[PDB]
Nucleic acid binder design. Structure first.
Ligand code: K
Ligand code: K
Ligand code: K
Ligand code: MG
Ligand code: MG
Ligand code: MG
Ligand code: MG
Ligand code: MG
Ligand code: MG
Ligand code: MG
Ligand code: MG
Ligand code: MG
Ligand code: MG
Ligand code: MG
Ligand code: MG
Ligand code: MG
Ligand code: MG
Ligand code: MG
Ligand code: MG
Ligand code: MG
Ligand code: MG
Ligand code: MG
Ligand code: MG
Ligand code: MG
Ligand code: MG
Ligand code: MG
Ligand code: MG
Ligand code: MG
Ligand code: MG
Ligand code: MG
Ligand code: MG
Ligand code: MG
Ligand code: MG
Ligand code: MG
Ligand code: MG
Ligand code: MG
Ligand code: MG
Ligand code: MG
Ligand code: MG
Ligand code: MG
Ligand code: MG
Ligand code: MG
Ligand code: MG
Ligand code: MG
Ligand code: MG
Ligand code: MG
Ligand code: MG
Ligand code: MG
Ligand code: MG
Ligand code: MG
Ligand code: MG
Ligand code: MG
Ligand code: MG
Ligand code: MG
Ligand code: MG
Ligand code: MG
Ligand code: MG
Ligand code: MG
Lengths: 81, 95, 50, 120, 124, 68
RNA sequence: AACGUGUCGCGAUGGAUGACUUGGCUUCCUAUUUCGUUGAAGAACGCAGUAAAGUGCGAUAAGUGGUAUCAAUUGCAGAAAUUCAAUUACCGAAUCUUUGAACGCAAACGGCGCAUGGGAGAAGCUCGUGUCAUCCCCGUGCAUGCCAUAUUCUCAGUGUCGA
RNA sequence: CACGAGUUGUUCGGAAACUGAGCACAACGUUAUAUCGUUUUGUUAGGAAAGUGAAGGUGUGUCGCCAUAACUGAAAAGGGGCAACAGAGAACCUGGGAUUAUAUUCCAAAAAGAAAUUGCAUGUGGGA
RNA sequence: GAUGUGGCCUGGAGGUUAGGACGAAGCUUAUGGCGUGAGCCUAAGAUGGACCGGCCUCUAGUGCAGAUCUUGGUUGGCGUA
RNA sequence: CCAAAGAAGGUGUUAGCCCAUUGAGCCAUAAACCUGAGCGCCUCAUGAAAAGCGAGUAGCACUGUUUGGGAAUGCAGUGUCAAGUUGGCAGGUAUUUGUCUGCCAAAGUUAAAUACAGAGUAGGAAGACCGAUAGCGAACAAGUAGCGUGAGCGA
RNA sequence: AGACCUGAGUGUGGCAGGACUACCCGCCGAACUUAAGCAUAUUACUCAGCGGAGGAAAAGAAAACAACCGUGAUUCUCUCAGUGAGCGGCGAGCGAAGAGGGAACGAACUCGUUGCCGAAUCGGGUCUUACAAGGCCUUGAGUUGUGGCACAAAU
């Protein structure tokens, strides 16, 4: 019946890891991610979940180049004479 | 060319082969099978491993067997030619 | 089973490498707050599902 | 300029100070003879300096600085020590503001610092 | 061991490559020693050798980039300059109007500017 | 915007500026101004200027003067 | 008697309270303050003598270069004062792995190409050299669309003419 | 729980490299909005998506025609891909005293050995 | 249900007076005194180890016994099923 | 004993004189910025001494929507659609006439006062705010551990 | 033969793509709710959705107010004004604009057209230290019109 017995009927997996966000939200059969909409060029962003936006926005990661370019802007692109 | 970095041909062998292994299985293979054991680059193949062995330790590898370990490192089982002694070159390496 | 893609194998390898106790000399450092790893994972408690 | 109107900001600037700011904060007064001959009131302590404890239990103890830890905000002095339970000798840390510099370890850079500092 | 930055800067490219090769060989030997136990005094030499390798490669790359920026300075080459050698600035700053283009005026505007210049004046 | 003739011509020089990217998407063209009601001034467009949103903010934000 | 009931003194369990706050929230101000195909933001792997997380960084990997400082860092170990090797701060010079708008083609593949430069080559050829077939490695270019352009490139049309 | 180890391939499974139920990049159209629709009934797109090269001419080498480089082309309708670890396809199989843990994956000159298959080359033997 | 109270209590702010390493707040009580009461004060800690009291005014996230209240802890049932 | 410094941080108890701080001032400097539109040289520019002006547009009609806009404030679709020789638009009750006022649509660029109602960079100033069940979910290796197939949830 | 027009294919030089999105601009667009029921109305031209830029955006230089003794681009502030305006099952409720005191402001310009000219234009090479607002050369674009002079702040 439904319940415990049917829990052992659940085989396979609907989602695997996503190449773009790595969230285990990539629908294998539809070949699209439930979290970042990959392989669509733009990502999922919805104002009904501002919490998710803050979870995914700029600054939550590394900003490898953003810090460098911010420092260069703050120093007015100083270069040697 | 859009790449302006200075990349030399005398260093690739040092990157291909990282360091030998000292474990009991490696020692048994040295003693019995004329085989050296190295941790190598995970993006490397057997042909470049043969070339790196030739350029680094001046020995001929008749066979190279590789595996990627459960910890992410690629191992290399490198059997030398019968004209080269694995124990001698292992002493030369410092193993 | 036997099959896994290499990317998944490397993720599993990294998770295997992270599954270590804290070194003892960490606890002796000045101003240290770390006692246990507290991110230790057991294969029978929580699933990575890669 | 660590001290400011906001105590939170002043304490944060003090206890998260970098190593060189910590060096400046860990200054000790010079002796009256050194004040007379250099016209400087205080200098950051340095290894191999000769200091005398003015405040604390070890007041009057005189020795040579062996370490300026700067992470524990203390300086280690050779003559200031105690035995452990094992009986082995361990160095007792002293805040530099509790000691007084009697002899300076002089280098060309420290001479330039002294010339920057002197009030004459 | 340790390589002085001035000594590296005085050396030639071939000597720089040879020094890099020898330091890489030393680092490989030290990795081997790091595997088979080895004295802590030996293992203290790994970081200096890695930093010397980094110093040699920094000198090589700075010399190469300066030479290539010199080679493409001529207007015959300057249109073919590799993107990696051109100035970065910012995407918008690269695409923005330069001051020369921004300040362009019509002949009517220039004649008006000359005919009625802005004055400096005072009132008592 | 990248053509030299455009960038060096004072008449059309303005459109190279970054504030005019996709100005049709923000309704800044003549047809956009038409359907925004910017064809009229004074009493025909009091609630339309500078935009409906701007006038709505003017007329609906609650003002709290410091001393009141 | 015993269970049990009180009261007091002392213990235990349990972490309230009070003090202390490198945190939060709120308000205000300054300015040569606003990312990315010259590859961003996000993802992922890795890097220390010792190193799980975190931080920092990218095979030059808890950092290279330069400028200021002026003798540390610090759990242990290792090394050991005028720029030249300390350590901190800052930044002009550099590095910057796999990806990702991701863009040669794909992808639960660390896969497979086409051109063009290289590299290594124990067969063969040539006198241990040099050269080097298959195989292998690396760099660059190669999405689509659009604009301009061709010292005036190659074309198509029972379009309009002209020879 | 702690420490130290262990997974070896020309032939095994996958990919390289097949099509299927199907998917949907391009293209076109639609939509205020592409994050929509069409996209195998031989098959995209009002749609010029072939960059290949039969025979010729010219030149090189090989012989007594063949191969190689160029100019003129016969022919070829219907763009690019993915989707099967049970369909298609697929050249290795025994012995071992070869492990603590891998093996149709390790074994070295008497390979314990016996093979099968690719790619490229050198001679041999025959033809151009 | 209304109202009054030189009516009590709490965290901050202007003032003003004090107190504290010869022990501050917190905490404990067969620990007494005062008040009709809200409470206030003293005493003792064989408690604590650094802040803080009174009065006038200003201010508010200002008083708990219960909301099948919230969180944390404990608990008889029970050495039982 | 200082004070042109009493400034509020640190140091083993409550510190103007133990330390750091709290000034005038000194040194250095890619460009950009400011200064007889700073000051020279070459080059290059440069000053004065009759006609008609925005057409599927504006209007009208119908329908929708929006507005305080009410015989219709603005806009949209479709229909059909001008005038400029006495022109056109506006003058908040529809129509037809006159007379007056303003103004000259259907092309374009423009600083500053204004916003920042869950942004960001580099710095500052703070507060009659909260004081670890409070204040941000997060004073801690917190969007972390953990949960869900997933969107998400979340100490 | 060739030319023009209309379309292709390659080389060369560029740009777009995503992120952020608190404010700002365009579209799209609810319901809970209130009306003590509820359908117009309200919430609200709001939330959610789609697209776009900046350091601010948008607006801005009268086809504007007004009816004055007149004012004079835009934006914003106080007031106008919760209004003896006005819109509303004229219910619940909505609801502005002139003027006046101010902030800011060197604030003004550019096309098209009409007259007079007519390649005087623009890209490429190349030389002046120079991808010069320069000189020479170039059918290469361009006469199916680039550019110059004048138009009320003019004469
Ligand atoms: K002062
Ligand atoms: K002190
Ligand atoms: K209409
Ligand atoms: Mg089932
Ligand atoms: Mg399924
Ligand atoms: Mg988006
Ligand atoms: Mg294998
Ligand atoms: Mg299985
Ligand atoms: Mg289970
Ligand atoms: Mg799995
Ligand atoms: Mg002083
Ligand atoms: Mg107004
Ligand atoms: Mg780590
Ligand atoms: Mg490198
Ligand atoms: Mg790709
Ligand atoms: Mg793509
Ligand atoms: Mg024809
Ligand atoms: Mg275990
Ligand atoms: Mg282990
Ligand atoms: Mg589609
Ligand atoms: Mg069909
Ligand atoms: Mg099919
Ligand atoms: Mg068709
Ligand atoms: Mg397939
Ligand atoms: Mg099969
Ligand atoms: Mg197989
Ligand atoms: Mg087994
Ligand atoms: Mg074998
Ligand atoms: Mg009562
Ligand atoms: Mg309070
Ligand atoms: Mg009692
Ligand atoms: Mg309350
Ligand atoms: Mg209570
Ligand atoms: Mg019990
Ligand atoms: Mg103090
Ligand atoms: Mg001047
Ligand atoms: Mg007009
Ligand atoms: Mg019309
Ligand atoms: Mg309405
Ligand atoms: Mg505008
Ligand atoms: Mg801001
Ligand atoms: Mg909390
Ligand atoms: Mg919480
Ligand atoms: Mg965008
Ligand atoms: Mg509500
Ligand atoms: Mg109702
Ligand atoms: Mg009701
Ligand atoms: Mg109802
Ligand atoms: Mg409304
Ligand atoms: Mg919205
Ligand atoms: Mg932006
Ligand atoms: Mg603007
Ligand atoms: Mg006005
Ligand atoms: Mg009034
Ligand atoms: Mg009134
Ligand atoms: Mg309304
Ligand atoms: Mg006014
Ligand atoms: Mg013209």
């Amino acid at each position: 019946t439904k319940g415990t017995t049917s829990m052992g009927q659940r085989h396979g997996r609907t989602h695997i890891l996503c190449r773009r966000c790595g969230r285990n939200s990539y629908h294998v059969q539809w070949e699209r991610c439930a979290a970042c909409a990959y392989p669509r060029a733009s990502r999922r962003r919805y104002n009904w979940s501002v919490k998710a936006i803050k979870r995914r926005r700029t600054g939550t990661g590394r900003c490898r180049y953003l810090k460098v370019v911010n420092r260069r802007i703050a120093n007015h692109f100083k270069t040697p004479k | 060319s859009n790449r302006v970095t200075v990349e030399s041909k005398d260093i690739a062998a040092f990157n291909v082969i990282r360091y030998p292994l000292t474990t009991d299985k490696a020692m048994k293979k040295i003693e019995e099978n004329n085989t050296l054991t190295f941790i190598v680059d995970s993006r490397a193949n057997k042909t470049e491993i043969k070339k790196a062995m030739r350029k680094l330790y001046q020995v001929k590898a008749v066979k190279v067997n590789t595996l990627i370990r459960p910890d992410g490192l690629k191992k290399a089982y490198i059997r030398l030619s019968a004209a080269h002694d694995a124990l001698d070159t292992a002493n030369k390496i410092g193993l | 089973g036997r099959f896994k893609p290499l990317a998944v194998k490397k993720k599993y390898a990294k998770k295997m490498n992270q599954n270590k106790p804290v070194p003892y000399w960490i606890r002796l450092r000045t101003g240290n707050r770390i006692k246990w790893n507290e991110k230790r994972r057991h294969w029978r408690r929580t699933k990575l599902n890669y | 300029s660590i001290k400011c109107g906001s105590r939170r900001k002043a304490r944060r600037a003090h206890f998260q100070a970098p190593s060189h700011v910590r060096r400046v904060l860990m200054s000790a007064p010079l002796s009256k003879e050194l004040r007379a001959k250099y016209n400087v009131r205080a200098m950051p302590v340095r290894k191999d300096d000769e200091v005398i404890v003015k405040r604390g239990t070890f007041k009057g103890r005189e020795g040579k600085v062996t370490a300026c830890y700067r992470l524990k905000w203390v300086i280690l002095i050779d003559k200031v020590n105690r035995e452990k339970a094992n009986g082995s000798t361990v160095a007792v840390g002293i805040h530099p503001s509790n000691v007084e510099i009697t002899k300076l370890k002089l280098t060309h850079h420290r001479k330039s610092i002294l010339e920057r500092k002197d009030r004459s | 061991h340790h390589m002085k930055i001035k000594d590296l800067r005085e050396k030639s490219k071939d000597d720089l490559l040879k020094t890099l090769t020898e330091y890489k060989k030393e680092l490989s030997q030290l990795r081997v020693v790091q595997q088979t136990g080895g004295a802590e005094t030996r293992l203290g030499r790994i970081r200096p050798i890695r930093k010397s390798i980094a110093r040699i490669l920094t000198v090589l790359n700075q010399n190469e980039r300066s030479n290539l920026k010199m080679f493409y300075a001529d207007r015959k080459l300057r249109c073919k300059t590799p993107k990696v050698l051109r100035t970065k600035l910012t995407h918008r700053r690269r695409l923005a109007l330069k001051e020369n283009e921004k300040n362009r005026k019509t002949s009517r505007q220039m004649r008006q500017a000359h005919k009625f210049p802005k004055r400096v004046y005072a009132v008592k | 915007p990248m053509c030299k003739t455009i960038r060096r011509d004072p008449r059309i020089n303005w459109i190279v500026n970054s504030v005019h990217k996709h100005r049709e998407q923000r309704g800044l063209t003549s047809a956009g101004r038409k359907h925004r009601g910017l064809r009229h001034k004074g009493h025909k467009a009091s609630k339309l200027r500078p935009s409906y949103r701007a006038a709505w903010r003017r007329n609906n934000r609650i003002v709290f003067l410091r001393k009141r």
